[PDB]
Amino acid sequence: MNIFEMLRIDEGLRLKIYKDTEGYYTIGIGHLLTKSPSLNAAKRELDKAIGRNTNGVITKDEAEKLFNQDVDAAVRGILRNAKLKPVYDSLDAVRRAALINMVFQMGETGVAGFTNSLRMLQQKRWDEAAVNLAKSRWYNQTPNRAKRVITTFRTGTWDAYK
């Protein structure tokens, strides 16, 4: 199992504009298009992202191309962030994937907002960090996905995804 397969399980794949759990216009593998209510503002972002007139529909390849870009951006954003980088450097390969997942879903700013849990992860206090991560809007809004991510932090294995 790897970051790509893990995110593909959490986000799914959709070839037509859809609304995410928060109600925002999305497409592909969790690719956020816009927070605007306008389905047209969304089709516009979409064409701009793909470099063609899509009329809200893309192919598998296009979805995969956006997905590669997004994972790359997540990793690069972590490495460029003064609060995230030290955490990432401290972790093993599995737990590194769990942090990339959180960043992909909620952005760098969101994650950097989990100051206390991040400090616990750095100190390798696994059980304490899993408990603190659960006291969040994130866990309350997307409980099944949060549980999988949290178990990955607690155990350092891919168990929740197998």
Residue numbers annotated as active site: 11, 20
Residues 6+ apart with CB under 8 A from 123: none
Q: How far is the CB of 146 from Cl ion (least distance, A)?
A: 7
Residue of 142, 151, 155, 161 that binds Cl ion (CB under 5 A): 142
Number of residues in contact with Cl ion under rule CB under 5 A: 4
- Kindly tell me which of 50 and 91 has the beta carbon lying closer to Cl ion: 50
Residue of 58, 87, 104, 145 that binds Cl ion (CB under 5 A): 145
Contact track, Cl ion, 27-66, x by CB under 5 A? ----------------------x-----------------
- The reply to whether 32 sits in an annotated binding site is yes
- Residue 151 engages Cl ion in binding (rule: CB under 5 A): no
> How, if at all, do strands 14-19 and 25-28 pair?
antiparallel
> How, if at all, do strands 31-34 and 25-28 pair?
antiparallel
Q: Write out the DSSP string of 56-112.
A: TB--HHHHHHHHHHHHHHHHHHHHH-TTTHHHHHHS-HHHHHHHHHHHHHHHHHHHH
- Asked if residues 99 and 6 have their Cβ atoms less than 8 Å apart, the reply is no
- The reply to whether 4 sits in an annotated binding site is no
Q: How far is the CB of 89 from Cl ion (least distance, A)?
A: 28
Q: How far is the CB of 10 from Cl ion (least distance, A)?
A: 8
d(Cα 32, Cα 30) in Å, to the nearest integer? 6
For Cl ion, the binding residues (CB under 5 A) are: 49, 142, 144-145
